[PDB]
Amino acid sequence: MILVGLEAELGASKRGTDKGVRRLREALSATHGDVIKGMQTITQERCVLYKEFRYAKNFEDYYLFCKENLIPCMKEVFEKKEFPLILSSEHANMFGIFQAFRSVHKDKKIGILYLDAHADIHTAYIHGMPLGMVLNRVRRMSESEEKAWQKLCSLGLEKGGLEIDPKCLVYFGVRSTEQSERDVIRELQIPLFSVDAIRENMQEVVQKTKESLKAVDIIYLSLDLDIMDGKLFTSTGVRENNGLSFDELKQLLGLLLESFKDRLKAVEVTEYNPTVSIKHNNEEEKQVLEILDLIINSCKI
């Protein structure tokens, strides 16, 4: 297995999520990352630098960085046969990472399992819009600006890739969105399983997920820890109430990993920010580490 750890090229020590990533990397290294009973699960720990997207503030810089640094590095990772566990730090990085994923699997239909309290389709003022860029639904805007966005949303695809089928993006636990995001979801008919549907019948949720993904060749799982209830888990930047319990997430994760074991080619876990926790113990870190053990132990086979 390959462990990818994202870190901001600039000002990483000021970022609570980057600190989360370094904590998890060191923790992993000791365990999964070391020889346990004659076996080393994580054979490589790779650090990947990223640049924060500040929209108008640094559009060009971000564009160039992604095209020249982030995407090329992630493609190198996705080109290896070994299963990759990606610590993204911040969900916004999912864009560059996923474009690299699409680039490597250019002739494959890709499905997305997105566990998050947010839809991440449109920037709200809080959370980015990686999916809005993956889906090409970024939207006042000049023709030059739309040209710039088309340029960006297209990175890493101009030797081609398929466009993502909005119906193959499956949302889990989404509960905090903008009407503009809800309009895209309704219009594109993107399957969305709420906290209640998951809690009421996880089995049906998974079965309906299979139906939506029956035609895809490979799957990408992106997990945002804020899918867990904001009161129960506080080590995340944007906490949302009415979320899943720690055990519910573990149950949903186990089923999804087992149900899609064959086509799952990558797992991304993001938004772990220990600096904003309101608790004074090891509880939350232990929970994240347990989430990681569960993912690693299921996918290493």
262 is in an annotated binding site: no
CB of 64 to Mn ion, least distance (A): 24
Of 105 and 118, the one with the shorter C-beta distance to Mn ion is: 118
Q: Smallest distance from the beta carbon of 109 to Mn ion, in angstroms?
A: 23
Is 293 assigned a ligand-binding role in the annotation? no
Residue with the shortest CB distance to Mn ion: 91
| Strand order across the 264-270 sheet | 44-50, 2-8, 84-87, 264-270, 218-224, 110-115, 169-172, 192-193
List of residues 6+ apart from 61 with CB closer than 8 A:
51
Binding site for Mn ion (CB under 5 A): 91, 116-118, 120, 224, 226
Identify which of residues 224 and 284 has a Cβ nearer to Mn ion in the complex: 224
Find the shortest distance in angstroms from Cβ 33 to Mn ion. 26
Nearer to Mn ion, 128 or 156 (CB): 128
Angle, CA of 40, 91 and 109, to the nearest 5° = 75
224 among annotated binding-site residues: yes
Q: Measured at the alpha carbon of residue 251, what is the angle toward residues 247 and 253, in degrees to the nearest 5?
A: 115
CB of 185 to Mn ion, least distance (A): 15
Which residue number, 116 or 284, has a Cβ lying nearer to Mn ion?
116
The least CB distance from residue 38 to Mn ion, in Å, is: 38
Taking the least distance from each CB to Mn ion, the nearer of 83 and 95 is 95
Q: Return the number of the residue (120 or 181) whose C-beta is nearest Mn ion.
A: 120
Residue number with CB closer to Mn ion (238 or 295): 238
Tell me how far CA of residue 211 lies from CA of 148, 174, 185, in angstroms.
36, 20, 18
| Total Cβ atoms within 10 A of residue 134 | 22
Report the amino acid identity of residue 173: G
- In the chain, the largest separation of any two C-alpha atoms, in whole Å, equals 60
User: Is 196 annotated among the ligand-binding residues?
Assistant: no
Separation CA 78–CA 85 (nearest Å)? 11
Is position 120 annotated in a ligand binding site?
A: yes
Q: What is the DSSP string of 235-283?
A: SSSS--SS-B-HHHHHHHHHHHHHHTTTTEEEEEEE---GGG----SSH
Give the separation between CA 192 and CA 217, rounded to whole angstroms.
21
Q: Minimum CB separation from Mn ion for residue 41, in Å?
A: 27
Least Å from the CB of residue 193 to Mn ion: 15
Helices in 189-245 by DSSP H: which ranges? 195-200, 202-213
Radius of gyration of the chain, Cα coordinates, nearest whole angstrom: 18
Which residue ranges are tagged as binding site for Mn(2+)? 116, 118, 120, 224, 226
Which residue ranges are tagged as binding site? 116, 118, 120, 224, 226
